[PDB]
RNA sequence: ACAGAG
DNA sequence: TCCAGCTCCACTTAA
DNA sequence: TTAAGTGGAGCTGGATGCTCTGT
């Protein structure tokens, strides 16, 4: 398609390829993997962390 | 054969010479460029030619050190040398009162003769060499560097210039086939010259033990 | 090298809690086995 | 002890 | 699942 | 004849990747 550009409003050289993909949302999210130490609790054998 | 059994007799006692100049026995010019049908002159095929007694050399006296220090080889004809022909060859050794002598053995050597040479005497002391080593000059191939056996003067220089105790260099065996070409025993140091991938040279030693 | 006697580790190398660690119910039956010796002497 | 992720 | 040491046992030399 | 030093064959004990993320 003819596409145009939003930034500057003047017309893309190329024509870009359009349509409805197929797309599936998989379960690993960074608000259940974002983790910090700085200091904490220690197993009971090795007194580290 | 005939033609393939000379053939051994003629590079074999090629590079005994040369091993022989490389320690710093005389030999002449006309010993290493012994030509195969020049071999055939003063000894010829087989029937007439003999192993056991007419390829031997004594000729060789250690012409730096002193004409007196002077060195056998021998080319026993049993594949398998006992003890009986080491006596043999040693009586004939306390004779002539030589201390070195090389056995050039066929195929190997009896276990029970073999520990002889470690104990018959320190100052009496021969080394085996089995002719198939013989058949191709370990110093002229082209992975070998050269070696060179240095000085007393020139190992006291290396461990000064470096401020090193000889048991900090790296080792080299006696049980290496470079180092019972020369010869060495324990605690000489020799010089290898590896060559570079450039025109260069890189200089390295190694310690007998 | 032959063990007429035998250590018994710190409580800190086998902390109660693991109950007890491996080392602890081995020594008991070392006790345990050394009464049954000593018992059937007698 | 099993499954995942890179 | 693949690989170095250790030990047992036949196999010549040598007295 | 046999004492002994050394070959060849079987037994034994060792090793086999790095982490988080949950039940």
Known sequence: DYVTSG??????????????????????????????????????????? | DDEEETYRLWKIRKTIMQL??????????????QTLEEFKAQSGDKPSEGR??????????????????????????????????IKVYC????????????????????????????????????????????LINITEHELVPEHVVMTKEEVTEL????????????????????????????????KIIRPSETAGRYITYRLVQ | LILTRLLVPPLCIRPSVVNEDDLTMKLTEIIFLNDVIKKHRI
């Open chain 1, 7 to 49: 930034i500057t409003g003047e017309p893309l050289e190329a024509y870009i390829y359009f349509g409805p993909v197929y797309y599936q949302k998989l379960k690993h999210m960074v608000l259940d993997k974002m983790h910090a130490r700085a200091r904490g609790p220690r197993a009971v054998l090795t007194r580290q962390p």
């Open chain 2, 20 to 33: 022989c100049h490389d320690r710093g026995y005389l030999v002449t010019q006309d010993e290493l460029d």
């Open chain 2, 52 to 85: 056991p007694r007419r390829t031997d050399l004594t000729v060789l006296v250690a012409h730096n050190d002193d004409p007196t220090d002077q060195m056998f080889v021998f080319f026993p004809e049993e594949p398998k040398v006992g003890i009986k022909t």
């Open chain 2, 91 to 134: 009586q004939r050794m306390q004779e002539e009162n030589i201390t070195r002598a090389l056995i050039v053995v066929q195929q190997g050597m009896t276990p029970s003769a073999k520990q002889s040479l470690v104990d018959m005497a320190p100052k009496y002391i021969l080394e085996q060499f089995l002719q198939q080593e013989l």
């Open chain 2, 159 to 190: 461990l000064a210039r470096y401020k090193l105790r000889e048991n900090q260099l790296p080792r080299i065996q006696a049980g290496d086939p470079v180092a019972r070409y020369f010869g060495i025993k324990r605690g000489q140091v020799v």
